[PDB]
Amino acid sequence: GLMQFTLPVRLCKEIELFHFDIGPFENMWPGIFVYMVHRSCGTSCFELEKLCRFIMSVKKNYRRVPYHNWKHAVTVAHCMYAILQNNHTLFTDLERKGLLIACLCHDLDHRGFSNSYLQKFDHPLAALYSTSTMEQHHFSQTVSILQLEGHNIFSTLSSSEYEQVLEIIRKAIIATDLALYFGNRKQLEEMYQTGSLNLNNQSHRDRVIGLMMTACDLCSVTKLWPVTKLTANDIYAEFWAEGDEMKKLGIQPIPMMDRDKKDEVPQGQLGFYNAVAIPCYTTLTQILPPTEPLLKACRDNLSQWEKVIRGEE
Ligand SMILES: CCN(C)c1nc(Sc2ccc(F)cc2)c2[nH]cnc2n1
Numbered sequence: 184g185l186m187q188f189t190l191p192v193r194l195c196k197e198i199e200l201f202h203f204d205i206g207p208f209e210n211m212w213p214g215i216f217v218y219m220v221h222r223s224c225g226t227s228c229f230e231l232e233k234l235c236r237f238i239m240s241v242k243k244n245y246r247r248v249p250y251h252n253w254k255h256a257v258t259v260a261h262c263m264y265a266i267l268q269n270n271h272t273l274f275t276d277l278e279r280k281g282l283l284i285a286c287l288c289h290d291l292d293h294r295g296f297s298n299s300y301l302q303k304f305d306h307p308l309a310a311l312y313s314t315s316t317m318e319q320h321h322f323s324q325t326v327s328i329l330q331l332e333g334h335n336i337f338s339t340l341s342s343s344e345y346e347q348v349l350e351i352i353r354k355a356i357i358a359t360d361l362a363l364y365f366g367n368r369k370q371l372e373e374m375y376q377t378g379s380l381n382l383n384n385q386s387h388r389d390r391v392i393g394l395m396m397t398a399c400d401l402c403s404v405t406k407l408w409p410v411t412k413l414t415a416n417d418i419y420a421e422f423w424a425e426g427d428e429m430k431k432l433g434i435q436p437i438p439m440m441d442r443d444k445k446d447e448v449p450q451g452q453l454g455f456y457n458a459v460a461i462p463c464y465t466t467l468t469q470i471l472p473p474t475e476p477l478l479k480a481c482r483d484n485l486s487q488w489e490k491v492i493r494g495e496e
């Protein structure tokens with residue numbers, strides 16, 4: 184318990200910043216996560232032995248897909264860690280615990296295919312979960328792994344707190360279904376401007392955590408441009424495989440998933456930044472002013488994609 188995880192100097196410092204990249208060294212990612220849990224929650228919130236066992240079963244249940252992999256899990260968790268650490272007093276004890284775990288688990292057993300593709304393929308998950316298909320699966324994998332012998336990191340919580348934390352985690356993971364983001368942000372924006380936003384309203388808190396989850400999930404757009412640009416490669420590698428799989432079902436995929444339409448990527452990124460990314464971090468910055476660096480970094484990347492179109496790169 185006097186066993187404080189410590190990172191090298193450069194990582195100790197830069198891990199505090201929104202734009203931190205967790206690096207190419209897979210074997211340091213558990214240690215980075217534990218460090219963040221200890222700083223964000225306490226060395227007391229989880230039994231080190233159980234927490235490490237939990238982390239290593241979660242890693243095992245992420246697949247070797249170009250984008251929706253273990254590195255994405257730990258990147259999304261780091262973004263949450265920066266939000267939480269910049270908004271210390273805004274969050275309950277149960278929230279701080281649940282949200283880092285939710286972010287680590289949020290794409291558990293992802294196959295590199297959209298909810299759309301599962302439904303058109305007629306995958307059994309699509310029959311089990313009519314909406315937020317993969318997101319209900321991710322939550323289910325999280326509960327399955329928490330129920331493994333020696334893996335219940337929540338063991339010391341009361342029956343009450345345990346149901347509360349698993350309910351935070353469930354809502355947090357469902358919110359990562361981008362189909363639900365658009366409405367969540369509209370409501371949050373309306374609420375904020377008519378001055379009805381009330382962080383004491385549990386239903387309001389839910390919506391604000393939902394947006395956090397979108398912001399953390401989309402955080403590749405808030406990195407330094409060379410990170411942003413190389414991550415886009417990984418994202419499109421998955422989309423274009425999906426597109427291929429659509430063509431095998433006899434379905435012309437949307438252009439974003441068609442590798443024949445690679446040329447249209449820069450214009451595609453503009454729409455995404457304008458319709459999703461920029462509104463997400465704006466509404467977030469309005470609700471949580473210390474998250475302004477995400478909006479700033481996002482705007483910088485919008486500017487790099489504009490330059491790519493102008494053939495300025
Ligand atoms: C509307 C195109 N689209 C959804 C999309 N998504 C992302 S992240 C992402 C991953 C999976 C999703 F189901 C949704 C979003 C992007 N990052 C850079 N360009 C992008 N375009």
Ligand SMILES: [Mg+2]
Nearest residue numbers: 289290359360
């Ligand atoms: Mg997901």
Ligand SMILES: [Zn+2]
Nearest residue numbers: 259289290400
């Ligand atoms: Zn994700």
